[PDB]
Design a binder for this molecule. Sequence first.
Ligand SMILES: *[C@H]1CC(=O)[C@@H](O)[C@@H](O)C/C=C/c2cc(NC)cc(O)c2C(=O)O[C@@H](C)[C@@H]1C
Ligand SMILES: [Mg+2]
Length: 305
Amino acid sequence: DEQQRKRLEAFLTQKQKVGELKDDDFEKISELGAGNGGVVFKVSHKPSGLVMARKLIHLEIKPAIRNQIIRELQVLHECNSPYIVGFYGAFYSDGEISICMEHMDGGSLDQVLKKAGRIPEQILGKVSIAVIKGLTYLREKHRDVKPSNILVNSRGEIKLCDFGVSGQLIDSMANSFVGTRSYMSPERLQGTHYSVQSDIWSMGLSLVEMAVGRYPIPPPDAKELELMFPMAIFELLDYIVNEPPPKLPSGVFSLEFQDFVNKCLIKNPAERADLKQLMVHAFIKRSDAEEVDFAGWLCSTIGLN
Ligand SMILES: *[C@H]1CC(=O)[C@@H](O)[C@@H](O)C/C=C/c2cc(NC)cc(O)c2C(=O)O[C@@H](C)[C@@H]1C
Ligand SMILES: [Mg+2]
């Protein structure tokens, strides 16, 4: 796409001007989406004038380990796609790794979900297209999919944010903190290990969460649906592994959307749909030919002006 080629080359143009990144070059503007493994700040890169998002991972380790993490992250400089958050750079300074990224003014979809209550079907169609393309980019040029990892902006863009190219980095945060496992596929929880197929599962679950406005397991056996229209993490993960997958309620959502998530959420990974299959699924082909005002919906919902 041409508007997409123009924005990708504008990004790189701006990025070519920045040069090597250093702590003392950054001014704090605010804190964003803080929590998780590290805090995140909106920052100004004073020399260039660029606003950026900076993730800080407090870690105390050997100069070797950190020099390795920094080099493994350089990998992200070649990942240029409209569906992946722009990466400016990564460095270490005074006990903490920094990862600097394009500032997505819409934030992440967990935040948008909190504010909107639930995300409409037609918007989730756009989200689905972006995630599928994003995931198709990562496979064709070589993950953890959940609402907090999908960022959005006022230009209508939807992108994945991920720093798990390193691994060793993840290696060394385990003793410090560990990201939630409540989006992992039953076959990762049973140890079989990743395939792109486990990210389809996660995409499916995230979409149901955003549709209904709540983490969907366990099902809302209640009038909560009627209202709509406790489990410890270990009870939950058994539940994922042993019980049937969640689904959308009926009536409220189109059958095509129901079917799309059902196919992402099939427990057996061999039977669960693949990306080639999702790309041509009817929900997707229909969503692709709707012209949905995502920016307009987004700006209204979170109060961007
Ligand atoms: C993205 C992934 C990440 O670590 C997630 O935990 C995010 O939910 C944290 C949110 C980051 C964020 C938030 C805003 N809000 C206005 C804007 C952004 O551009 C980012 C962002 O780019 O996060 C990057 C730094 C991480 C690595
Ligand atoms: Mg300093």
